Design an enzyme around this catalytic site. Structure first.
Site, short mmCIF file in Angstrom:
data_model
loop_
_atom_site.label_atom_id
_atom_site.label_comp_id
_atom_site.label_asym_id
_atom_site.label_seq_id
_atom_site.Cartn_x
_atom_site.Cartn_y
_atom_site.Cartn_z
N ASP A 141 -3.18 -2.55 -5.14
CA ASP A 141 -2.21 -3.61 -4.80
C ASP A 141 -1.28 -3.92 -5.96
O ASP A 141 -0.08 -4.03 -5.78
CB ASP A 141 -2.94 -4.90 -4.37
N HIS B 92 0.83 -1.20 0.00
CA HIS B 92 0.00 0.00 0.00
C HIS B 92 0.87 1.26 0.00
O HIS B 92 0.57 2.22 -0.71
CB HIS B 92 -1.01 0.05 1.15
N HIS C 131 -9.23 -1.64 -5.11
CA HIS C 131 -8.15 -2.06 -4.20
C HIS C 131 -7.20 -3.09 -4.83
O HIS C 131 -5.98 -3.03 -4.61
CB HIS C 131 -8.66 -2.55 -2.87
N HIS D 207 -0.74 -11.23 -4.97
CA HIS D 207 0.67 -10.89 -4.75
C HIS D 207 1.65 -11.88 -5.31
O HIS D 207 2.63 -11.48 -5.91
CB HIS D 207 1.00 -10.64 -3.28
#
Ligand SMILES: COC1([C@H](NC(=O)c2ccc(C#CC#CCCO)cc2)C(=O)NO)CS(=O)(=O)C1
Ligand SMILES: [Mg+2]
Length: 298
Positions: free
Chosen positions: A240, A79, A236, A263
């Site tokens: 990311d 973030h 969001h 991720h």
């Protein structure tokens, strides 16, 4: 004239808590010289352990993006890195008093505010960009992450969550013309109640609450005051991806498309990109007027 490297104009200090560890953490952002990149510094350790925010230093990618050097980690970097990327900060030391970046309100909003309040400083060296020149795809089962050539910077994301709260979720943002701050920065992280006892048993989400996350039950958002955007969830995901992508160490000229990615696959995409030197090149822009991207006044 040249598009120049940027650092911070003044130091920024913040206090908070780690999303996953629940630990109290003191954050200090400092200016840094040309070509430093973003470096995380664990100032609670003696000697101080410094971990460059680069793809090669990523260890775990379970719930968050973690940097590792030996047995020292810096958790949940994405973030803050998204905020750095969105504001075009090349060089900075990020000092932390504990192993996780503070979660703040769950978004990049507080970080962009703190940074923009401090101001940025243009530096006397050309900004380097990584330009995508071939398509690069990684897949794992039904998940996909791809880089495509594109004269600018654009991120698309599609999520297929089987969940009532979505009433399929898709967005595409072109930052060569739509601004990180307004379109994405305020999008908060989120968690489902069905996972939280399990996560907390594994020492994850220990700092999570309605104050720093959208909390979702079987059917609805539990947060009393609701959503900041209709599509806050997918925004969001984009936030990311921008942060995970900044582990390349330079801003991108190209398009990212994510399909149920997260991720781990984001990092796999970067590693594959870096390995395929036919797929990218480093460029600079001697004339801001002919460049395919622009940045806000510092
Ligand atoms: C893995 O899930 C994502 C991740 N967020 C988290 O892991 C995550 C965020 C919030 C919580 C929570 C909570 C809570 C509560 C109240 C009950 O204690 C738990 C986990 C995150 O934002 N990582 O950067 C990536 S995403 O799918 O976009 C959200
Ligand atoms: Mg996140």
């Amino acid at each position: 004239a040249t598009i120049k490297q940027r650092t911070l104009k003044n130091i920024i200090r913040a206090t908070g808590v780690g999303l996953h560890s629940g630990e109290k953490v003191y954050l200090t952002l400092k200016p840094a010289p040309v070509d430093t990149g973003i470096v995380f510094c664990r100032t609670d350790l003696d000697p101080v352990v410094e971990i460059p925010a680069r793809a090669e230093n990523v260890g775990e990618t379970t719930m968050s993006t973690t940097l590792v050097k030996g047995d020292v980690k810096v958790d949940t970097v994405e973030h803050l890195l998204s905020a750095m990327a969105g504001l075009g900060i090349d060089n900075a030391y990020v000092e932390l008093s504990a192993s996780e970046v503070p979660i703040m309100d769950g978004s990049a909003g507080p970080f962009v505010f703190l940074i923009q309040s401090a101001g940025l400083q243009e530096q006397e060296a050309a900004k380097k960009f990584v330009r995508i020149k071939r398509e690069v795809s990684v897949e794992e089962g039904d998940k996909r992450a791809v880089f495509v050539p594109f004269d600018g910077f654009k991120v698309s994301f599609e999520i297929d969550f089987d969940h009532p709260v979505f009433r399929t979720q898709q967005a595409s943002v072109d930052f060569s013309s739509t601004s990180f701050v307004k379109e994405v920065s305020r999008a908060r992280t989120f968690g489902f109640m069905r996972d939280i006892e399990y996560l907390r048993s594994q020492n994850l989400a220990l700092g999570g609450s309605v104050e720093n996350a959208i909390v979702v039950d079987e059917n609805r958002v539990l947060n009393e005051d609701g959503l900041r955007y209709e599509d806050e969830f997918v925004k969001h995901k984009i936030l990311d991806a921008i942060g995970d992508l900044y582990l390349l160490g330079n801003s991108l000229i190209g398009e990212f498309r994510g399909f149920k990615s997260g991720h781990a696959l984001n990092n796999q995409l970067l590693r594959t990109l870096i390995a395929d030197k036919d797929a990218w090149e480093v460029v600079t822009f001697e004339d801001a007027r002919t460049a395919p991207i622009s940045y806000m006044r510092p």
